[PDB]
C-alpha cells in the first residue's frame, strides 16, 4: 500500500470461518490455484510435429490448506469439527471459510474466499519430555471448489 514497492509482509493472517477458530493461530500455508495441462501432438501438411498443443482442464481444487493452531488449550472446537464430519451431519460440517490477509498495518487488503471447508485431519506435535516449544494442533482443511480472489 504505502509505497509503490510494497510486500504483503508476514504476521498478518486471520479467518472468519463459522467454527470459532480464533485467538492463537499461526502458520497457514499451501494455498493453491491448481490447473493442469493437456497435450495434443497436432499434425499438418508439412509433417512437422506441429509443436505441442495445450488445452484447459478442471479446477483441481482439493487444496488441503494446513492451519497450525499452536497449542491445544481447553478449547476443543477443532476436534469437534472433525468428529462431526466423521459421523456425517453435513448441516454443520460443510462450513464456508475465509482467509484474511492484512497489509503492513493491520487492515485487510485481500481475502481468499474458500467455497467449502472440511477439516479432514487433525494432528498433534511430538510429546517429547525435555524440549522447549509447544504442542501444535495442525489442521488440514479440504475444499470442494477452489479458492476465489
Amino acid at each position: 500500500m504505502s509505497l509503490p514497492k510494497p510486500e504483503d509482509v508476514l504476521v498478518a493472517p486471520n479467518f472468519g470461518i463459522q467454527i470459532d477458530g480464533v485467538m492463537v493461530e499461526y502458520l497457514n500455508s499451501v494455498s493453491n490455484l491448481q490447473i493442469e495441462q493437456d497435450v495434443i501432438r497436432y499434425q499438418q501438411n508439412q509433417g512437422t510435429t506441429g509443436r505441442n498443443n495445450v488445452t484447459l482442464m478442471p479446477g483441481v481444487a482439493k487444496d488441503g490448506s494446513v492451519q497450525v493452531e499452536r497449542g491445544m488449550s481447553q478449547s476443543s472446537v477443532f476436534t469437534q469439527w472433525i468428529n462431526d464430519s466423521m459421523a456425517g451431519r453435513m448441516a454443520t460440517a460443510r462450513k464456508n471459510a475465509t482467509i484474511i490477509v492484512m497489509d503492513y498495518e493491520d487492515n485487510p487488503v485481500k481475502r481468499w474466499n474458500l467455497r467449502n471447508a472440511w477439516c479432514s485431519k487433525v494432528v498433534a506435535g511430538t510429546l517429547k519430555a525435555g524440549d522447549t516449544n509447544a504442542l501444535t494442533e495442525t489442521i488440514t482443511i479440504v475444499f470442494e471448489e477452489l479458492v476465489v480472489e
Binding site: 508439412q46 512437422t48 510435429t49 482442464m57
Partner: protein, 140 residues
C-alpha cells in the same frame, strides 16, 4: 552415405482425398498378408509344403482430434444409402527434415467403423475419433 537417412515414427503425413476429410493424425495396422496353403506330403516326413495363394490387405485405423469438421465423416459414412465414393488416400512417413522416406497410397478406400470420442469427466485427454478404413491395394 551422409550419415544415412534413418527412418522415424513421429514425423509423417496422413491424408484422405475426396470428401473434405482433411488430414488425420495417427495411423495403425497398415499391413499386407498372403494366405499360404499348407499341403503335407504323405511319403516325405520332415516339412509341410508352403504354396502361396492370393494376397490380402488388412484394415487401417486412423485417429485424429475431434474437430468441428467431423460432420463430413458422418456424412460420408451415411452416404452408403444414396451412393458412396472411394477417393484415394495416402500414408507417408517422413524424417524431421520434411523429406520423404516411404510413401504409400491406398488405391480405393471405404469406411468400416467410426468409434467416436469417449467422454469422461475425470480423464484429462483430448477426444480422438477413430475412422477405420477398408482397402483395395497399394499404388505405384
Amino acid at each position: 552415405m551422409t550419415r544415412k537417412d534413418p527412418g522415424s515414427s513421429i514425423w509423417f503425413s496422413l491424408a484422405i482425398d475426396g470428401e473434405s476429410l482433411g488430414y488425420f493424425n495417427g495411423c495403425e495396422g497398415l499391413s499386407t498378408q498372403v494366405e499360404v496353403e499348407q499341403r503335407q506330403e504323405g511319403g516325405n516326413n520332415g516339412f509341410v509344403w508352403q504354396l502361396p495363394t492370393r494376397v490380402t490387405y488388412s484394415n487401417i485405423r486412423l485417429t485424429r482430434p475431434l474437430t468441428p469438421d467431423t460432420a463430413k465423416v458422418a456424412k460420408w459414412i451415411s452416404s452408403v444409402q444414396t451412393g458412396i465414393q472411394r477417393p484415394t488416400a495416402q500414408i507417408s512417413a517422413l524424417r524431421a527434415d520434411g523429406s520423404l522416406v516411404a510413401r504409400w497410397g491406398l488405391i480405393d478406400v471405404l469406411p468400416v467403423s467410426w468409434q467416436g470420442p469417449s467422454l469422461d469427466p475425470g480423464s484429462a485427454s483430448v477426444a480422438n475419433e477413430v475412422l477405420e478404413i477398408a482397402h483395395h491395394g497399394f499404388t505405384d
